[PDB]
Scaffold this active site. Structure first.
Site, PDB file in Angstrom:
ATOM      1  N   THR A 196       0.955  -1.303  -0.121  1.00 14.39           N
ATOM      2  CA  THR A 196      -0.003   0.061   0.021  1.00 14.39           C
ATOM      3  C   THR A 196       0.778   1.223   0.003  1.00 14.39           C
ATOM      4  O   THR A 196       1.861   1.386   0.555  1.00 14.39           O
ATOM      5  CB  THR A 196      -0.986   0.146   1.239  1.00 14.39           C
ATOM      6  OG1 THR A 196      -0.281   0.001   2.392  1.00 14.39           O
ATOM      7  CG2 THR A 196      -2.273  -0.912   1.188  1.00 14.39           C
ATOM      8  N   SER A 197       0.088   2.591  -0.454  1.00 14.43           N
ATOM      9  CA  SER A 197       0.535   3.786  -0.381  1.00 14.43           C
ATOM     10  C   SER A 197       0.884   4.002   1.015  1.00 14.43           C
ATOM     11  O   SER A 197      -0.178   3.938   1.785  1.00 14.43           O
ATOM     12  CB  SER A 197      -0.101   4.683  -1.126  1.00 14.43           C
ATOM     13  OG  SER A 197       0.924   5.614  -1.458  1.00 14.43           O
ATOM     14  N   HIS A 212       7.506  -0.073   4.523  1.00 17.79           N
ATOM     15  CA  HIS A 212       7.037  -1.430   5.074  1.00 17.79           C
ATOM     16  C   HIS A 212       8.196  -1.945   5.211  1.00 17.79           C
ATOM     17  O   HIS A 212       9.412  -1.859   5.008  1.00 17.79           O
ATOM     18  CB  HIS A 212       6.358  -1.886   3.719  1.00 17.79           C
ATOM     19  CG  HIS A 212       5.224  -1.369   3.169  1.00 17.79           C
ATOM     20  ND1 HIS A 212       3.730  -1.565   3.715  1.00 17.79           N
ATOM     21  CD2 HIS A 212       4.800  -0.709   2.180  1.00 17.79           C
ATOM     22  CE1 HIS A 212       2.857  -0.938   3.404  1.00 17.79           C
ATOM     23  NE2 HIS A 212       3.536  -0.236   2.257  1.00 17.79           N
ATOM     24  N   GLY A 213       7.843  -2.995   6.228  1.00 16.53           N
ATOM     25  CA  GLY A 213       8.773  -3.578   6.549  1.00 16.53           C
ATOM     26  C   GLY A 213       8.444  -5.020   7.212  1.00 16.53           C
ATOM     27  O   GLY A 213       7.159  -5.290   7.327  1.00 16.53           O
ATOM     28  N   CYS A 234       7.073  -2.142   9.789  1.00 15.11           N
ATOM     29  CA  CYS A 234       6.480  -3.152  10.582  1.00 15.11           C
ATOM     30  C   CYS A 234       7.581  -4.199  10.965  1.00 15.11           C
ATOM     31  O   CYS A 234       8.786  -4.081  10.202  1.00 15.11           O
ATOM     32  CB  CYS A 234       5.561  -3.983   9.885  1.00 15.11           C
ATOM     33  SG  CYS A 234       3.840  -3.180  10.099  1.00 15.11           S
TER      34      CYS A 234
END
EC number: 3.4.22.56
Lengths: 237, 4, 237, 4
Positions: free
Chosen positions: C34-35, C93-94, C135
């Protein structure tokens, strides 16, 4: 009443709290784990060190995976209401995220979970400290010349960086524990715990280097790792 | 010196 | 000359050092990521915050996995001799041990390795700080009412506990970054960095709670995690 | 509120 500040854990409960020392030296033959020479020196140093900080120290030697778990469960179910903090010291073989009972391994997360904010409410909002002397893998450092989170208020003091071996001297005890006790002994009445742990990092990093006849294990270094989810400053006084 |  | 103490990093070099901000907001469609709405607010806050600490801030937006790696490599090869410290902020993100480029993931360890004591010698003995908003898994916290080691002098400030989601508000920015900037803004001229990070832990832990129409994601909490292998106290002044 |  004058203005108040709220930056430090309340450490003036009637009791400092428990200090549980799990000292695994001798392992069932079937595990293929070596006897951990020097670890008794660590256990004695820690006992005395945390005795002087006014902790109620319980030493346990050579516990199975089952005994470790049952011990942690039982301790987490005691009434900690009159206690400021909780400390658990693990001395054993390990891998990443794992420490060894005498007959097999236990997840570190399984030990720490017993004390989560929601599972042991007499320790909610109080510092829960885990000190781990154990390997976290097999790498060698060659050196160079209205609600609170249930994971809040945990501190894990690791002897070594993630993925790395941790070093123990058979005569003098482990680099980490000996350094930790020295700094507690020297700074517990003047520094907040993180700065104490930071002096431990430096001492270990600068004063120790391995000696081995095996070139693979010779001249190696170690840096411990502070894992903090504390929400306040902790002073032992 | 030994490893854990 | 009078007696000297050596407990703090030397932070009085001609330059404070680089602050690299990697701001990944928009991801290639094929990744299914996601953005990351609100992240620009984080990037702006950090830029201003580290500007005031006198860091040379470089903002980079929307970098591929390749660009992240090439950037880190190139930066690690600059001459840091006149610089006190290094700071790298990752917003993306992660998963555990991983951050996302716009087209796929990079190992955190691969980024940090560029700066190891033996691979970037103009930063040897100086603080290398990595701040990660991403994350680390998918758990939710329901809350409750002559040589130095090559891994030495690294600090990783994680937005969230190991294994857990990390929270970002689309309007206000992420809980972690906003809290971090607030505390830097407020305490950078008076507290050592660990105690600053500890106030960040408390702020995040106590002041934020998720709101969602989905009961699975509603009323969740977050505790950041300090990963310290620093050997000295760090003061920004 | 969103997750990363």
């Amino acid at each position: 009443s004058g203005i108040s500040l709220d930056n430090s854990y309340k450490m003036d409960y009637p009791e400092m709290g428990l200090c549980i020392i799990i000292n695994n030296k001798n392992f069932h033959k079937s595990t293929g784990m070596t006897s951990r020479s020097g670890t008794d020196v660590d256990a004695a140093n820690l006992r005395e060190t945390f005795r002087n900080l006014k902790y109620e120290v319980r030493n346990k030697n050579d516990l199975t995976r089952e005994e470790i778990v049952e011990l942690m469960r039982d301790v987490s179910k005691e009434d900690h209401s009159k206690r400021s903090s909780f400390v658990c010291v693990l001395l054993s073989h390990g891998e990443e995220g794992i420490i060894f009972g005498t007959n097999g391994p236990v997840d570190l997360k399984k030990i720490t979970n017993f004390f989560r904010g929601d599972r042991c409410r007499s320790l909610t909002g109080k510092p829960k400290l885990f000190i781990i002397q154990a390997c976290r893998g097999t790498e060698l450092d060659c050196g160079i010349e209205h609600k609170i989170p249930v994971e809040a208020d945990f501190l894990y003091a690791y002897s070594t960086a993630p993925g790395y071996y941790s070093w123990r001297n058979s005569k003098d005890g482990s680099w980490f524990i000996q350094s930790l006790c020295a700094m507690l002994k020297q700074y517990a009445d003047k520094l907040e715990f993180m700065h104490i742990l930071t002096r431990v990092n430096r001492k270990v990093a600068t004063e120790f280097e391995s000696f081995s006849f095996d070139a693979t294990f010779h001249a190696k270094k170690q840096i411990p790792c502070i894992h903090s989810m504390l929400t306040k400053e902790l002073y032992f006084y | 010196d030994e490893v854990d």
